[PDB]
Symmetry: D3
Subunit: 280 residues, 6 copies
C-alpha cells in the first residue's frame, strides 16, 4: 500500500529502461538455474556459483563417460572435488596431480573425509613430467589447467599415460584476435597463466601429440558469466580479501579485472574438447 | 612462450587459490550457467547473456502455464511486451497486456507492429486493480513479477473476475520469511517503487480469499538472487553511463541501497512461481 | 458372426451414452498406466493398484532426492515398503516410526526378509514426541500421515530432528470449503483422522515450525482415483471384509464412503510439498 | 480430533484393509503422470476422460500420421479421437459408424471446431466401406472390430488403404476358450462378437494381406477402464435406470462381475500396427 | 585445388545419379550411428558392426529388463558376449546353452577372462531337451536361435524351465509369402537352419507352449542391413575366408548370398517378441 | 530339416565367419534406432535413404534454422536437404551447385512440392558467390567443400552471411599425410581435393573470419556410407556399366577398396558449426 499505481507508472516511464540496459529485452529474471536444479543451501553468490560448478562437473562426467572400474587421471586436480564427484557417480578410481602443495593436502583431506582414500589418490606432481608409466589410465581430463603449462609437453604426457583408445577431455581457452602486450601480461600477473594459443595452433599441438579430435563445444558464455561472478565478488569484498591475501594482490585484481573481462569478451573463446588416443 | 614455470604456478595457488573458493565455490572451474542445448549468444556482454536467460525463463513460464492455440491470455503487468510476443508466436494465442506506464505500453505496441502481430497482441495502459475488461473474458493469465507493485488482494480478485471458470493464472511473487525492519521496508519503495512482500500464509489467504485454488508452487529464489547480482554489477560497473542517462540522484540511490537490498533478499525473502486455478462449473 | 451391423448401431443409439456418463468424452480405454510400465502379474484390482503405489513411491524418491549414505526419517511409515524401496534405490539408511504395533512388526519382518535390517529401523514412536536427538537425519518425509496427528507438534518435532538444510517431504490434504459437522465427523468415524486445515492455515503452521516452502504440486486426482479404487473394492467384497474386520466396520464404510468421496471431490485438495529447514 | 493411541489401535485392527484394496503400501497410486494437467474436477468421469485423451494421444504417437494425409476412423464413435488427431497432426479424418446418434454427435464436433472440410463423419458399414480403392494413407479401428466380422472389415480396410500405409488396431483376444455363458455375456452386455485367439486373429490379418509390425499389451488399461465403468454403473443405479430403463441397467449390474473376472483371467487386449505392403 | 568447378560440374552431370541409385534420394552420408553413440575404436567394417551388435544387445536388455539377483537362461547362447553384457549391466546370473562345443569353450573362456565364472555358466545342451528342472529361471531369451530348432519343442521346454510370471524374449523370423523349394534349400545349405513359419502358425505354437504374447516389434531392416554387412565382408575377403574355411564353404556363400538377400527382402520379416509364462 | 548335431558341427567349423564379419556376437546390428519407422522396402538404397533422411533431420536440429530465415545451401545437389529444411522449419532456402543436371532436378523437386517461392536453386560457384554481402541468416556446406578451394569457399560464405549467422560444415581431414597414389584417387574417383589437416583447416576457418562453435566426429557414418556404396557397385556392376559406361565402373571397382582403407586409416569426418561474429 506504500505505492500507488500512478507512481509505479511514472517510475517505469522514467527509469524502466535501466532494466533493459542491465537484464536484456524483458523486465524479469533470467533462468540461471535449470528447473530440475535443487534449491541451494543459501542464496550467497558463492553458494550459487558452487552449484553451477557441480552441474558443470556433472556435464563433464557425462561427456567423457568414464565406465565403472576404470581409472581416471585428473590433470591439474585442484582441491579434488571434481575427482570426488566422478568417483562417487561412476564407481571409478581417480588419480589427481597438482603443483600446489596446499591444494593436494586439501584434496587428500577431502578423500579422507568421505572415506575414499582407496579410490582417490592425490599427489604433488607436474603434468609436464608425469610420474606414471605408459598406458596407466583409461581416461583423463585437464579442466582449466593447460593454461598454466607448456601445452605440447602436457599433451604428450597425457597421451603417453593414456591407454590406446582412451579419451582425454580438455577445457581450454583460445584467442580469436591477436592480443596486445598489456593483455598478455595480465594473463601472468592476474592468474599466473600463459596466453592461450590460436585455435589452429592448438589443434596442431593436439595432433602433434598423437591425438584425434572427436568433438569441440563452445562454453564461452559460461566463462564470461563465471568471470562476472568473480569480478562482482572481488569488488564487493575488497576489504575482506585485502586482509587475507594482501592489498597488493587484491588491488592488482581490482585494476586488471575490467581489462581482462573485455579481452575475454572480445578476443578469446573457451571450449570443451574430447581427444582420443587412437587404438591399433 | 610460457610466461610462468610450474614452481611459480604452484606458489600462486598456495597463496591465492582460495579467492577462487571464496567467490566461485567448492571447485576451481567455471559454472554451467547456460544449459548445453542453449545457443551460443551473439555477444558475451552481460546484458546479452542475461537477455538469453530471460527468454529461457519466458519459455519455462509458457511451458508451465501451457496456453492452447486459439486461447486469449491476459498479461497482467506486461512491461514492454516481449513475454507476450514469444507466447503469441510459440503457442498461436492472442495476448492482451496491461501496464500502468504509458512508455512501456507504447514500446509494446511498436514491438507488435514491428513483428506484424497487431491483431493478436493488444497492449493498453490500465490498472490491474481495476481492470476495464468484462467478466470471464480470458482463458488464462499471468502476473510475471508485477504483483509487488500492487495491492495483491485487489489485483487477484480482479484477475479472478476476468478469468473464465476453469482457467489458470500464473503468478511469480515474492514472500518474506522474516519480519523486515523499517529501513528494509522503505528500500522497497525507494529503490523498486514496490510494496513489501507478504508472508506465505498471508499470501495464500489472499489467494484463497480471491477464490483461487493453488495447483503448484516452485521456488525460483536462486534465479532472482542471480538476476539481482547481474543488475547490481551492471549498475556498479556503469555508474557514469547511467547517471548521464537517468541522473545522479537515481543512480546514487541504487549504489547506496543495492547492498542492503541484496542481503535482505538473500536472508529474508523467497521467490516462487505459483499456478492458481479459477474453479470450473 | 454373432451380431449384425444394424443390431450394433441400434445398441449405440440406445445406450452409447452410458460410456460417456462413465468413461468420459470418448468411447475407449483410459491410459491408466504409462506405456513404459510393465505388464503386471495379475489383473486383480489390488495388484494394478499396488504397481501404481510403487510408481507413486518412485516419484517421491525422485522428488525428495535422497543421496547415498544419508539417513532418512519416515514419519508415519506404515508397513515399510516405502522405506525399503528408498533404501534399495538410493543406498540410504531409513528410520520409520508409527503408532501401530502391527505395522511396525510387519515393517521389521520386511527389512529382515530383504536383508536390510542394518539400514532399516522401525519403531513405535510418536511423531509429536519423537525420541531421537536434534539434527539426527539428513531428510524426512510424511506420506499421508499428518492427518492423524497434531500438525503443529509433528512438524516442529520433524524440524527438530532434521539437520539444518534438510528437506522434509509432506503429502497433505487441505480444505477449500468450510466442512459441515457431519463431514468433519466422517473423518474420525471412517479414517480416524483429523480434518485438514486451510492452505493459508497450513503454511502458517509450516512457517511457525521454522520451515521454508520450496515446492507444492497438486495430486488431488491421484487421491480421488485411489479412494475410488478403495471404495470399489469395499463394495464388491463386502462378505469377505465383514468376515475379516466385522460387520460394524464394513457397514460404516458402505454408508460413508459415498458421502466422503463427494466431500473429497468438492471441498479438499491433496498436494506434495517440499519443506526445508534453513541452513546455517 | 483423535489421539495417537486411537490411531495405532485403528491400524492394528483395520490397517490391512488398505493392503487388500490398494496394494503393498498404504498410500496413493500414481494414476496420472506428474506432467499431466490438474483436471477441471475430480468426478470419476472427468478423470477417466483425461485418461481417454492421453490414450488417444498415445495412439496418434504410435500410428504417427503425417501432415496432409487422410485418416480413416473405422468405428469412429462420437468423433473425439478424430478431432484430436486432426488438430494435432494437420490431417483430414473420415469416420464411419453404424449409429446415427453417434454420427450426429460427431458431426457437431466437426462443425464446432471450424474444421468440417477436414473432419467427415458418415453412417456406413466397415464390412462394406463405400469408399474407393487406395483412398486413405492410414486408418485405425479403436476397439471397434469386436462388433464386426473381422476378415470382412480387415479386407475392406486393406482395399481402401494406399500401398504402404498402416492400420492401427486395438483388439482383444482370448487366452483360454470361454464357456458358453461367457460367450453369451458378450452379446447381452455389449453387442459384440467373442474375441478370437491370437494365432487365429493373425491368420485373419494375414489373409487380408497385412504385415504385422508391432503389438503391445494394454490389458491392464482395459482392466482399469472396466473397473471405472463398473463403479459408475453400480454407484449410479438410479440415474441410469431412469435414462436407459431397468432391464438394461439390471443386465449390467448382474453381468459386469462375471464379465470382469472373465476379462481378467481369460482375455488380453493389445494395440497392433498392420502394414499394407508397398509396391515391390 | 587439383580440380576445377567445371570439371566437378561435369562429373555430377554424368555420374551424379550413381549416388542416388546406391545411397538414396540425397547425396550425403547415412546416419547409421546415433549421435550419442561413442566413436568406435576403429573404422573396420567388423568393428562398426560389432558396436551395432552391442547396442542391439543393450536394447534386448532394456526390453526384457532383468532385475538384479535373477537367473536368466540364454537359449542358444553363441560365444557368450550377450550373456556377459547382461550380467554386468543388471547384476544377474546367466546360464547359456548351445549345441556347439567350440562356442561353449569360447564362452567359458570369455567368462574366465572377465572373472564372472560364478555368475556365467555355459554348457553344451539341446534347447529341445533342456537338462534343467522346472521353474528354474526367472527369465530367458532365444536370440536368433529358434530357426535352428523345432520351435514347439524349444518353446515348450523354455516354458517348462521358466518360473511362473517370468518372461521369454524371442528374436525370430517369419515368412510373409510362400517359399519355393530352392529358397527353402538355401536355409539349410547356407545357415543350417529351418524355414521360418508363418505369423499365425508361430503364435499358434507360442500359445500351444502356454505363452502369452505381451509385445512384438519389427526389426526386419536391421536383419536386412546385417546381411548386407555379412555379404560385403564375404565378397571382399574371398581369399582370406577360403584359406580359413575352405573354398567349398565360401563358394556356397558367394553363390547363395545374393538369392538369400532377395528372399529375405521380399518374403520374410524379423521381429522381437516378449512371451510371458502366466502367473498363478 | 536340420538336427541339433548338424547345427553344432556347423558352428564348430564355420561359426567364426560371423565373428570375422559381424563382430564379437552372433546376431544382428541395431542399424536403425527402435523409434525409426519400418521402411517401405528392404532394398539397400531404400534403407540407406531413410538413414540419409535421419541424417538431414540431425543437421536441421544442429544448425536450428528459425522460421522466416533465409538459408544458403552451398553445394546443394538435387535439393532434398533443402526441401526437408523448408517444410520442417518454415524457411526460405537458396541452393547453388556447379552441376546443371543437379540444379534442374532440384527445381523440379521444388516445383513438384509447390515450394518454388521458398526453394531457389541456381547454377553457381561457391568460390565466387553471386549474392550480396549479408544476404543470408545461416548456411551449410554438406559434403561439398572437398570439391572447392576451402579458403575461397569459406571466405565467400562469410561474405554472404549476416553478422551472427552460422555456417554448418561437413568436411574431411587427414590425420596422416597421404601417399601420391592415395591423393590421386581423390581426383580419379570423386573429382575431389585432398582434405587438409585439422589445424590447417581451422587456420583457414579463422582466416575466413569464422569462430568455431562446435565440432562432432561423424567418421563411422561416412565409412558405413562408403561400405554401402561399394557394396552397391560390386553387386550391380552390369547395371552401372550399362548406365555409366565400363570406364567409370571399372575405376570404382579398382579403387574403392584402396579408397576405403585410406578413409579408415588416414582420415576423419566431422560436422562443425562456424559463426560469423556479431557486431
Ligand atoms: N604444471 C602443472 N602440473 C600439474 N598441475 C598443474 C600444473 N599447473 C597448474 N596445475 C594445477 O591446475 C589446477 C588449475 S585450477 C583447476 C582445478 C581443478 N581442475 C578444478 O576443476 O577445480 C591447479 O590446481 C594447479 O595446481
Ligand atoms: N568501471 C568500473 N568497472 C567495474 N567496477 C567498478 C568500475 N568503477 C567503479 N567500480 C567499483 O565497483 C564497486 C562495487 S562494490 C559496491 C557495493 C558494496 N561494496 C558491496 O559490498 O556490495 C564500487 O566500489 C566501485 O569502486
Ligand atoms: N497496478 C498496476 N496495474 C497494471 N500494471 C502494473 C501495475 N503496477 C505495476 N505494473 C506493471 O507491472 C510491470 C512489472 S515489470 C514486469 C514486466 C513484464 N511482466 C516482464 O516480464 O517483462 C511493469 O510493466 C509495471 O508497469
Ligand atoms: N460394422 C460396423 N461398421 C462401422 N462401424 C461400426 C460397426 N460396428 C460398430 N461400429 C462402431 O464402432 C464404434 C465402437 S465404440 C469405439 C468408438 C471410437 N472409436 C472411440 O474410440 O471412442 C461404435 O461407435 C460403433 O458405432
Ligand atoms: N501420531 C503418529 N505418530 C507417528 N506415526 C503415526 C501417528 N499417527 C499415525 N501414524 C502412522 O502413520 C501411518 C499413516 S498410513 C501411511 C503409511 C506409509 N507412510 C505409506 O506411505 O505407506 C500409519 O501407519 C500410522 O501408523
Ligand atoms: N537345438 C539347439 N539347442 C541349443 N542351442 C542351439 C540349438 N541349435 C542352435 N543352437 C545355438 O544357437 C545359436 C544361434 S547363433 C546366436 C548366438 C547368440 N544367441 C548371439 O546372440 O550371438 C548358436 O550358438 C547355436 O549353437
Ligand atoms: N565449386 C562449387 N561451387 C558450388 N557447388 C559445388 C562446387 N563444387 C561442387 N559443388 C556441388 O557440391 C555438391 C556435393 S555432393 C553434396 C550434395 C548435397 N549437399 C547433399 O547433401 O545432398 C554437388 O551438388 C556439387 O554440384
Amino acid at each position: 500500500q506504500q505505492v500507488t499505481a500512478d507512481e509505479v507508472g511514472d517510475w517505469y516511464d522514467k527509469f524502466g529502461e535501466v532494466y533493459h540496459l542491465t537484464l536484456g529485452e524483458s523486465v524479469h529474471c533470467g533462468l540461471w538455474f535449470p528447473p530440475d536444479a535443487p534449491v541451494p543451501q543459501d542464496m550467497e553468490l558463492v553458494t550459487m556459483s558452487s552449484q553451477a560448478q557441480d552441474r558443470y562437473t556433472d556435464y563433464l562426467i557425462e561427456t567423457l563417460d568414464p565406465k565403472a572400474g576404470q581409472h581416471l587421471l585428473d590433470i591439474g586436480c585442484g582441491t579434488g572435488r571434481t575427482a570426488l564427484k566422478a568417483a562417487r557417480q561412476r564407481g571409478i578410481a581417480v588419480t589427481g596431480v597438482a603443483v600446489s602443495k596446499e591444494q593436494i593436502a586439501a584434496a587428500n583431506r577431502l578423500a579422507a573425509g568421505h572415506g575414499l582414500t582407496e579410490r582417490l589418490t592425490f599427489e604433488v606432481a607436474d603434468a609436464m613430467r608425469l610420474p606414471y608409466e605408459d598406458e596407466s589410465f583409461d581416461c583423463a581430463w585437464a579442466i582449466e589447467s593447460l593454461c598454466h603449462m607448456d601445452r605440447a609437453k602436457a599433451l604428450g604426457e597425457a597421451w603417453r599415460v593414456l591407454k590406446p583408445g582412451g579419451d582425454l577431455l580438455v577445457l581450454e581457452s583460445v584467442v580469436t584476435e591477436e592480443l596486445t602486450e598489456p593483455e598478455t601480461a595480465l594473463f601472468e600477473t592476474l592468474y599466473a597463466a600463459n596466453v592461450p594459443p590460436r585455435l589452429g595452433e592448438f589443434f596442431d599441438i593436439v595432433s602433434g601429440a598423437g591425438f584425434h579430435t572427436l568433438s569441440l563445444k563452445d562454453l564461452s558464455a559460461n566463462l564470461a558469466m563465471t568471470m562476472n561472478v568473480f569480478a562482482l565478488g572481488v569488488y564487493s569484498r575488497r576489504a575482506e580479501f585485502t586482509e587475507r591475501f594482501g592489498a597488493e594482490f587484491v588491488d592488482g585484481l581490482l585494476a586488471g579485472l575490467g581489462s581482462a573481462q573485455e579481452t575475454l569478451i572480445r578476443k578469446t573463446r573457451f571450449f570443451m574438447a574430447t581427444l582420443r588416443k587412437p587404438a591399433v
